[PDB]
């Protein structure tokens, strides 16, 4: 009742909700130093549109730095900045810091409740069970202001919005809160699975924010099931888990020896093939809740294999700037997933990214079917007309609310997990290898790359065509791998050296003429610059036939 109406109101009243939101945002902010600069002295949409510049992160980083260093929030926001969000996006190798306050949590939990309703409208059999949700709290990074920088969901978990969350199936997990709150994710992932297994009959949903993490959970399961079952059998958690909260809370889940349940799970895990393993271990699971769009699409085949084509439900599109909105057709196929922006989240504008829309910038209500755009965000934390760097495509309309397929993050050439390595990053990394090559009597002719997920964990593959005896200097080429990795950003390093979600960077040295042949291949397809990443399977086949040596970082 209330919900059908709530969604009707949100999606029919788009222009006026957006315009009221803008006014709500701008009015108290006229006296901030940032807006004073552009003479926004009263609210007026036309003046905001004429005088407030559309900016990139780098344009306004100087203002952000000052707040990070302890200066008054009102440099940019009359609503007090009480923390920051650590973006997966980076600047000079360091994670971007976006301003944050409780409004972010009000939006987030609003979105959680809305999508909960969307899911329950379309999926039956969930209200009595729990979810085995692979949820992780990360470590924060203190800023000189005394305000912490956290990743988005951690800013939620480390708050009473989470601790005092609603008491219903959607917020009920097989893992104790202590597990979710444990900053050691090697330990918390292990515990997630153990708790999941002990309470396997109650599991009606499983998932994680992103598909990569769901895949890693299953792979870790495949690598740990013997140990997990030993804990279940004895009723004791392995000694190696150090986190006191995990020890205490998981001890209670376990309760005592469960040899019989251990036998049951071992029998399942001992089968010939891991196919359908998630459904076999968790037979009451109704769906998998995880983002399968953007670069996460690469994990869809693996997920279907492990999950016996249980529905993959991809609910939410969001960022460090703002949550955007949700998938109002949760049971659609991963390739047809679009996200309906919610007009109460932030004020949204769009920069056309093809010829289909000749305007310079357009409101949410005005985006055209079939056109791509870059979202531009004005939020409740001191970001005004901020370009987001994602490309989206309008695929439809729910009432008056446009629905958007996520196309890509612009410039990104390599992404396995949370890492997002852009073309510039790659060029820098390759540049370091070049120095190594020069220092060993070689030079680099050309290069390209590829995100390999054919094995776990996934890793970056870089093809190098070198030029000047019986053998390649393996020490030098190994060193090339190392310097490339070392030039990458903190997010890659965390995944690689702490999460183990990314494996050693691999260099594949290719034969003389490889990249000339590559060029021949592409122009035979119709076509020039060597692409900096390859996503065509045929081109990839061409490269592979050219490989003469393989090296790995470490
Ligand atoms: N549902 C989704 N589908 C595809 N890409 C997403 C989704 N949610 C987030 N992303 C990507 O992750 C970025 C957010 O990074 P962050 O600043 O770390 O929160 C977005 O701008 C997108 O590039």
From Swiss-Prot:
It is an enzyme of class 6 (ligase). Optimum pH is 8-8.5. Salicylate binds at residues 112-115. This is 4-substituted benzoates-glutamate ligase GH3.12. Expressed in seedlings, mostly in cotyledons, leaves, hypocotyls and sporadically in roots. Not detected in unchallenged adult plants, except in flowers. Belongs to the IAA-amido conjugating enzyme family. Keywords: Coiled coil, Hypersensitive response, Ligase, Plant defense. One of its GO terms (biological process) is detection of fungus. Specifically and reversibly inhibited by salicylic acid (SA). Disruption phenotype: Enhanced susceptibility to virulent and avirulent bacterial pathogens P.syringae pv. tomato and pv. maculicola ES4326 with or without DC3000(avrPphB, avrRpt2, avrB, avrRpm1, or avrRps4) as well as to the oomycete pathogen Hyaloperonospora parasitica (downy mildew) isolates Emoy2, Hind4, Hiks1, Wela3, Cand5, and Wand1. Impaired hyper-sensitive response (HR) and systemic acquired resistance (SAR). Compromised salicylic acid glucosides (SAG) accumulation. Resistance is partially rescued by SA treatment. The gene is GH3.12. GO terms for molecular function: N-(4-aminobenzoyl)-L-glutamate synthetase activity; N-(4-hydroxybenzoyl)-L-glutamate synthetase activity; N-benzoyl-L-glutamate synthetase activity; N-vanillate-L-glutamate synthetase activity.
